[PDB]
Amino acid sequence: TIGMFNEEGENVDLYIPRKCHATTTLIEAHDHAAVQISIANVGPNGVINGTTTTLCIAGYLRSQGESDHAINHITIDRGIMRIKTGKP
Amino acid sequence: QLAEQLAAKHLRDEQNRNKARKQELKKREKERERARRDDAAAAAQKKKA
Amino acid sequence: TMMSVLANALRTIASAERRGKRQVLIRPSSKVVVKFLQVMQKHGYIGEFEIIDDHRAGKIVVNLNGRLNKCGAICPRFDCATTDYEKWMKNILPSRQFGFVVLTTSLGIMDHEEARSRNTGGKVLGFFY
Amino acid sequence: MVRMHGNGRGKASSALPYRRTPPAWLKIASRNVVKMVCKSSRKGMMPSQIGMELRDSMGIAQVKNVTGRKILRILKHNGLAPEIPEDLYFLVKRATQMRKHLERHTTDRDTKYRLILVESRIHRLARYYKRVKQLPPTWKYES
Amino acid sequence: MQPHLRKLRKLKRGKPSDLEESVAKALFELEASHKTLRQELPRFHVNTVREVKVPRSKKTVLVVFYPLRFLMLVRKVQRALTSELEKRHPGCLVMLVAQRQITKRPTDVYKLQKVQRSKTSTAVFENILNDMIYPSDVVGRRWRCRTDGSKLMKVFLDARDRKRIESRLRAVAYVYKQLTHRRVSFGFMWNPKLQQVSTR
RNA sequence: UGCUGUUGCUGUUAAAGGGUUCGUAGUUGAACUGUGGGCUGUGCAGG
RNA sequence: CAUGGGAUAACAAAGGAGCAGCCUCUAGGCUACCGUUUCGGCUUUUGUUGUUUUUAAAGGUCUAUUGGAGAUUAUGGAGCUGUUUCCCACGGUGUG
RNA sequence: AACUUAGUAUCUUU
Ligand SMILES: NC[C@@H]1O[C@H](O[C@H]2[C@@H](O)[C@H](O[C@@H]3[C@@H](O)[C@H](N)C[C@H](N)[C@H]3O[C@H]3O[C@H](CO)[C@@H](O)[C@H](O)[C@H]3N)O[C@@H]2CO)[C@H](N)[C@@H](O)[C@@H]1O
Ligand SMILES: [K+]
Ligand SMILES: [Mg+2]
Ligand SMILES: [Mg+2]
Ligand SMILES: [Mg+2]
Ligand SMILES: [Mg+2]
Ligand SMILES: [Mg+2]
Ligand SMILES: [Mg+2]
Ligand SMILES: [Mg+2]
DSSP D8-67: ----------S--SPPTT----HHHHHHHHHHHHHTT--HHHHHHHHHHHH--S-HHHHH
Three-class SS state of A45: coil
Nearest Cα to Cα of residue E62 among E26, E112, E11, E32: E26
Distance of CA D67 to the CA centre of its chain: 20
Residue C38: Cβ within 10 Å count: 16
Say if CB E74 and CB E81 are below 8 A apart.
yes
For residue C84, the CA-to-ligand 5 centroid distance in Å is 22
User: What is the stated resolution of the deposited model, in angstroms?
Assistant: 2.2
**Nucleotide nearest C33, from its CA to each C1':** F31
Three-class SS state of E185: strand
Say if CB C48 and CB E147 are below 8 A apart.
yes
Which residues, at least 6 apart from E51, have a Cβ–Cβ distance to it below 8 Å? E19, E60, E61, E62, E63
Interface test with E, best of D19, D65, D66, D67 (most E CBs within 10 A): D19
Question: What counts of helices (H) and strands (E) characterise chain D?
Answer: 6, 0
How far is C104 from C125, CA to CA, in rounded Å?
6
Helical (H) or strand (E) element with C127: strand C122-128
How far is A76 from A74, CA to CA, in rounded Å?
5
Report the DSSP pairing between strands C49-52 and C59-63. Answer: antiparallel
How far is E72 from E44, CA to CA, in rounded Å?
11
For residue D7, the CA-to-ligand 7 centroid distance in Å is 29
Distance of CA C87 to the CA centre of its chain: 19
Q: How far is E2 from chain B (nearest CA, A)?
A: 7
How far is E136 from E134, CA to CA, in rounded Å?
5
Q: Is the CB of E161 under 7 A from strand G?
A: no
Residues forming beta bridges with residue E158, ordered by sequence position: E189
Q: Is the CB of C1 under 7 A from strand F?
A: yes
Nearest Cα to Cα of residue C69 among C120, C1, C127: C127
Nearest Cα to Cα of residue C51 among B37, E134, E146, E196: E146
CA distances for D8 relative to A6, D12, D119, D121, D143, angstroms: 62, 11, 19, 16, 27
Which D residues 11-70 touch C at CB under 8 Å? 16, 18, 20
Residues E128, E134, E139, E143, Cα dihedral to 10°: -30
User: Using the beta-carbon criterion (under 8 Å), do A25 and C20 form an inter-chain contact?
Assistant: yes
Report the DSSP pairing between strands E184-191 and E151-158. Answer: parallel
Which residues, at least 6 apart from D1, have a Cβ–Cβ distance to it below 8 Å? D8
Ligand nearest to the CA of C6: 8
How many Å from the CA of E167 to C1' of G88?
A: 11
Which residues, at least 6 apart from D58, have a Cβ–Cβ distance to it below 8 Å? D28, D36
Is E6 near chain B, with CB under 8 Å? yes
How far is D57 from C7, CA to CA, in rounded Å?
46
How many Å from the CA of B22 to C1' of G33?
A: 32
Say if CB C103 and CB C115 are below 8 A apart.
yes
For residue D141, the CA-to-ligand 7 centroid distance in Å is 47
**Domains and their CATH numbers in chain C:** 1-68 (3.30.1370.30), 69-129 (3.30.1490.10)
Q: Is the CB of E4 under 7 A from strand G?
A: no
Three-class SS state of E8: strand
Which residues, at least 6 apart from E175, have a Cβ–Cβ distance to it below 8 Å? E52, E54, E61, E63, E95, E132
For E152-168, give the DSSP string.
Answer: EEEEEEEGGGHHHHTTT
CA distances for D97 relative to A79, B17, C114, D86, angstroms: 73, 50, 65, 17
Q: How was this structure determined?
A: cryo-EM
User: Using the beta-carbon criterion (under 8 Å), do E145 and C42 form an inter-chain contact?
Assistant: no
How many Å from the CA of A55 to C1' of G28?
A: 99
